[PDB]
Amino acid sequence: QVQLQESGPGLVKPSGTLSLTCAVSGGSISSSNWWSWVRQPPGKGLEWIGEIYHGGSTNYNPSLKSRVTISVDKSKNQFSLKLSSVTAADTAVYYCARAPPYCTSASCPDDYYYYYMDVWGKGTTVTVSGASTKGPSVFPLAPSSKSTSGGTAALGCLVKDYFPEPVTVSWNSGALTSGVHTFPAVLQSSGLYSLSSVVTVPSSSLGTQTYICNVNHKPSNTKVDKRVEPK
């Protein structure tokens, strides 16, 4: 029941060093497992970065070998990735993952230790840019009669003018997920992003239940909990 969570800086300057951490829960790093990294550039396919064993042994993608270092920390129960001399090509979503012990070479006595990655993290978005980071301004999208349709009503949160991607939004600290729809952001003319998140709710619950959108913009270390109330 291993679960993995990535943690990284969001923005990294050109020629700088990317640094990422993966926290391991529901399992121990001090076990036969290949703790691994994979990335996914926007709109493209998956690319293996490397893997590490808890004793220290690593294997890297030969096209990243000269820039990548993967490390493990048994006390904190986490492993990590460093990618130096980053450029725009290194802009991608970075996933940590777990691979069981494997033996794929033809010199292996056993052939049933297949190689695969069964557990994946949620991924973390890294952007390589000389522009500066900017946190969002959050505004409530209040419910009213012109957002109510029959027994259903809409309310939401507007998240304006942030950089870089991404922003994630939850409602009532995770205690509300039915009816939640966070829309993909728009890239405005200024180079900044904006998105909205909306929840459809029974219109008899307007004014009888509290609605709070939890906006997180990790690249600027900004969280905003916004109270949404009827007009």
Partner: protein, 210 residues
């Protein structure tokens, strides 16, 4: 290296085979990964033909020589996704190699009209001396839409920003369009409208300062 078709279609309830071809598959037990938009990859087949516990039995795998295959029997709507094959190369220290990916379109899904909600600028934003109209568009299929804006009954194109559609979890599509105004423009007008055109029909919502 490791080649697969980038695009493959299948009709609902029918069977589809997704192939992966390359010299690294010789003597190797491939694995296969499913990815939906906005989500991490999920292992669907490992060791040539084994399924993890949570994967439906309609997924299966095979391989011979340099070619491996993922088969979905009686494909369902929730199988619409990108699929990647995986191997480790037989040279060097055996680095991991991903196929380029196959996008699986599942045909015969129900069309849908767009659901349009239009929000006026919030009191808080106006008091911050800005004004944004927010037109939220969801649950349309296919995912092609155009959006026009009206000030009273006149067209307005200044200050419009509109996303490209994105795939929802129910395989329908979503989009949004923002109209930027000044607070004095918003409070003095009669109304503002968002017009959403989809498959020959138009949905228009209207809000007014009050």
């Amino acid at each position: 290296e490791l080649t697969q078709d980038p695009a493959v279609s299948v009709a609902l309830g029918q069977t589809v085979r997704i192939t992966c071809q390359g010299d690294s598959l010789r003597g190797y037990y491939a694995s296969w990964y499913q990815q939906k938009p906005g989500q991490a990859p999920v292992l669907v087949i490992y060791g040539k033909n084994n399924r993890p516990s949570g994967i439906p039995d309609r997924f299966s795998g095979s391989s011979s020589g340099n070619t491996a295959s993922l088969t979905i029997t009686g494909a369902q709507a929730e199988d619409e996704a990108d699929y990647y094959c995986n191997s480790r190369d037989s040279s060097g220290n055996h680095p991991v190699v991903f196929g380029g990916g196959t996008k699986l379109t599942v045909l015969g899904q129900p069309k849908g009209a767009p659901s349009v909600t239009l929000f006026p600028p919030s009191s808080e934003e106006l008091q911050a001396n800005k004004a944004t109209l927010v037109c939220l568009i969801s649950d349309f299929y296919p995912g092609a839409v155009t959006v026009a804006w009206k000030a009273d009954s006149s067209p307005v194109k200044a200050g419009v920003e509109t996303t490209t559609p994105s795939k929802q979890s129910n395989n329908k599509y979503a989009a949004s369009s923002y109209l930027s105004l000044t607070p004095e423009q918003w409070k003095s007008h009669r109304s503002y409208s968002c017009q959403v055109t989809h498959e020959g029909s138009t949905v228009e919502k209207t809000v007014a300062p009050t």
